[PDB]
Structures are given as C-alpha cells and as structure tokens.
Amino acid sequence: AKIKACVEEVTTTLEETKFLTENLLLYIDINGNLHPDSATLVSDIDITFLKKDAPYIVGDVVQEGVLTAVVIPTKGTTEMLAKALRKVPTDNYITTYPGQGCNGYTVEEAKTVLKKCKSAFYILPSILGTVSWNLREMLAHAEETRKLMPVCVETKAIVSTIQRKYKGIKIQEGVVDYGARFYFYTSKTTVASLINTLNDLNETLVTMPLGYVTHGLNLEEAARCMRSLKVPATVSVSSPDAVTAYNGY
Structure with missing residues (x-):
C-alpha cells in the first residue's frame, strides 16, 4: 500500500512500537557489523545474513524477514549519508537516527537525510565531568x-x-x-x-x-x-x- 512519508520520534521501547510496523531499519559497516544503536534491536532473530555477503560498499542494502540493513559512511559527508539512505526500499520502518556515534553525524544531519526519503520512519528514543587523571x-x-x-x-x-x-x-x-x-x-x-x-x-x-x-x-x-x-x-x-x-x- 502507498507509504505515508514521515519522520516521527516515539517514546516507546522497540516492543511497544511494533504496533506501528514489524519492519526494522538497521545500520551496518562495510563488514556487516551492526552499529551500536542497531545492535540491541535484533533479539531472537538470525542475523547471519548481515555478515554473510561482506565486504560491502556504502549504500548496499541487505534484507531478511522483518530486517533491512544499509551500509552507512563516516562523516564522509552529509551527501554520502543521504545517498546511502536513498537505497532503502520505501516502506514503514522502526529505526534510529542514521550516522550517530563513531560515524560522526549529528541528530540534525540525520533528520535532514531521513526527510529526503519517502519512507515512514518511527525513531526510537535516545553527563559526568571530563578530567585529566593519571x-x-x-x-x-x-x-x-x-x-x-x-x-x-x-x-x-x-x-x-x-x-x-x-x-x-x-x-x-x-x-x-x-x-x-x-x-x-x-x-x-x-x-x-x-x-x-x-x-x-x-x-x-x-x-x-x-x-x-x-x-x-x-x-x-x-x-x-x-x-x-x-x-x-x-x-x-x-x-x-x-x-x-x-x-x-
């Protein structure tokens, strides 16, 4: 059916968000390793297919059952991140903001990239002093x-x-x-x-x-x-x- 393009942040856990869709969008590196944000969303699912076809290029997409994974780059730039997300098949997805953590992108950069896609995205939710101690x-x-x-x-x-x-x-x-x-x-x-x-x-x-x-x-x-x-x-x-x-x- 026709997809209702949107970026909507939810406050619900993964299980509590599945009433919207069973489809999860995961982020992987060129070796098929899950990004830490995506790593906690694959409980009780066989993920052999993620590393099975490694090595990959940025923009590669792998799919099995309810899971879709895309290989994302490291801020090279916002252009490269947009280009990677455009490879994801249009659908309703539970996901996280792409490029967070080691990849070096900000929440604002991720929102820009997702709003350029045609999928409905449901974004899952989510300090001490810095010191010089020997x-x-x-x-x-x-x-x-x-x-x-x-x-x-x-x-x-x-x-x-x-x-x-x-x-x-x-x-x-x-x-x-x-x-x-x-x-x-x-x-x-x-x-x-x-x-x-x-x-x-x-x-x-x-x-x-x-x-x-x-x-x-x-x-x-x-x-x-x-x-x-x-x-x-x-x-x-x-x-x-x-x-x-x-x-x-």
Missing part, C-alpha cells in the same frame, strides 16, 4: 566509587600497575571485580562490541576515551564513538589541554 588516580577513584573501569589487556603498562596494586588479582578478559571493578577487553574486539557490552552492564564508568590508540582512533574519532555510550561516564584524557579539545569535540 592511572593511579583513576584506580583510586574506581575503588571508592565502585564505577566500572574498562582496561585494554594489550596495554601492558596498565596491566602491570593493576597486578602490583591488587596483589592476587587474576586478570582475564571480561568483568573482574577484585580491589576495583574492571572490564578487561582486547583491541581484537571492535569498539562497537565493547560499547554494546558496557551499555548492557548499565554501570557508571570511569574510562579513557574508548578506541583512542587501542583501535587506532585519534581523540576526535574516540569522542564521536563515545556518543554511543548510554551509561554515565567520568572520561579521563591525557592532559588539561586534551580536556578542552575533548569537551570541544
């Missing part, structure tokens, strides 16, 4: 506040400091609650998977910018990714100048 200060803060502290296991200087401060700790990937509460991860897992994990734990964090250095990101790229966190976080950067730069991004 590792010893961060560990002391995590210990007294019980905030979760993400730690990259490949950063040997950090692992050796934790082993020496918390004698007897058994460091392994995942949550380790010994002296302080840590989330140990490898750089061999994506920043997106890490953000999804921290969002699911739903704990307040004390953290360095995620992806910065460990995943080859610069501070601006890490700041963009950090927008995908749905938990409160005390972010600690390298120096007082990096505080201005980070809060500037």
